[PDB]
Design a protein around this ligand. Structure first.
Ligand SMILES: *[C@@H]1O[C@H](CO)[C@@H](O[C@@H]2O[C@H](CO)[C@@H](O[C@@H]3O[C@H](CO)[C@@H](O)[C@H](O)[C@@H]3O)[C@H](O)[C@H]2NC(C)=O)[C@H](O)[C@H]1NC(C)=O
Ligand SMILES: *[C@@H]1O[C@H](CO)[C@@H](O[C@@H]2O[C@H](CO)[C@@H](O)[C@H](O)[C@H]2NC(C)=O)[C@H](O)[C@H]1NC(C)=O
Ligand SMILES: *[C@@H]1O[C@H](CO)[C@@H](O)[C@H](O)[C@H]1NC(C)=O
Ligand SMILES: *[C@@H]1O[C@H](CO)[C@@H](O)[C@H](O)[C@H]1NC(C)=O
Lengths: 35, 49, 35
């Protein structure tokens, strides 16, 4: 309904706070899954 | 130029966007204008006549 | 660059809303890697 809107992406402030943490959790997950 | 031509160099700005600032001074968020631009415009053209 | 700036620790509530969970998430991993 908004006339003239455009396309881009919005970065979650928590996204780096989880891309460095969920991946850190994932890295911690990788620390036990492989063996 | 909105209302910035009385305090220096005039700076252009689209009219449909300028009114969104005037609402923001009243106390209503700007999302009420874009979602009702057609209704508001039809409600302003008729009034001036 | 700013004149008169002083040092201190900025307590970021983003940390206790993760550190307390890090006290729980890493506790889970500690509870997961220990056995
Ligand atoms: C911004 O990006 C979005 C996608 O992230 C664009 O929405 C997409 O617009 C196209 C229009 O070419 C849609 O294709 C249409 O598909 C229908 C079938 O569903 C078909 O009948 C139409 O003829 C047309 O091909 C596409 O579906 C739509 N994406 C989604 C998820 O619905 C949007 O257009 C972009 N905006 C700008 C300003 O570029
Ligand atoms: C604020 O903290 C900074 C960071 O440690 C201080 O800068 C360092 O200060 C030490 C002296 O304690 C110097 O040896 C370092 O060379 C400084 N580092 C840099 C990059 O300049 C700063 O002095 C502290 N200021 C106050 C007022 O506490
Ligand atoms: C993987 O876990 C061990 C203990 O199980 C720990 O010592 C090690 O630091 C972990 N790996 C990383 C990259 O932190
Ligand atoms: C550790 O894990 C076991 C099951 O894997 C669970 O029963 C126990 O409550 C856990 N301990 C803590 C402190 O969460």
């Amino acid at each position: 309904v908004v006339i003239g809107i455009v396309n881009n992406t919005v970065y979650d402030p928590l996204q780096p706070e989880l891309d460095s943490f969920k991946e850190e959790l994932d890295k911690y997950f990788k620390n036990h899954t492989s063996p | 130029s909105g209302w910035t031509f009385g305090a220096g160099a005039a700076l252009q700005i689209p009219f449909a966007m300028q009114m969104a600032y005037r609402f923001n001074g009243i106390g209503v968020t700007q999302n009420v204008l874009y979602e009702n631009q057609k209704l508001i415009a039809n409600q302003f053209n008729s009034a001036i006549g």
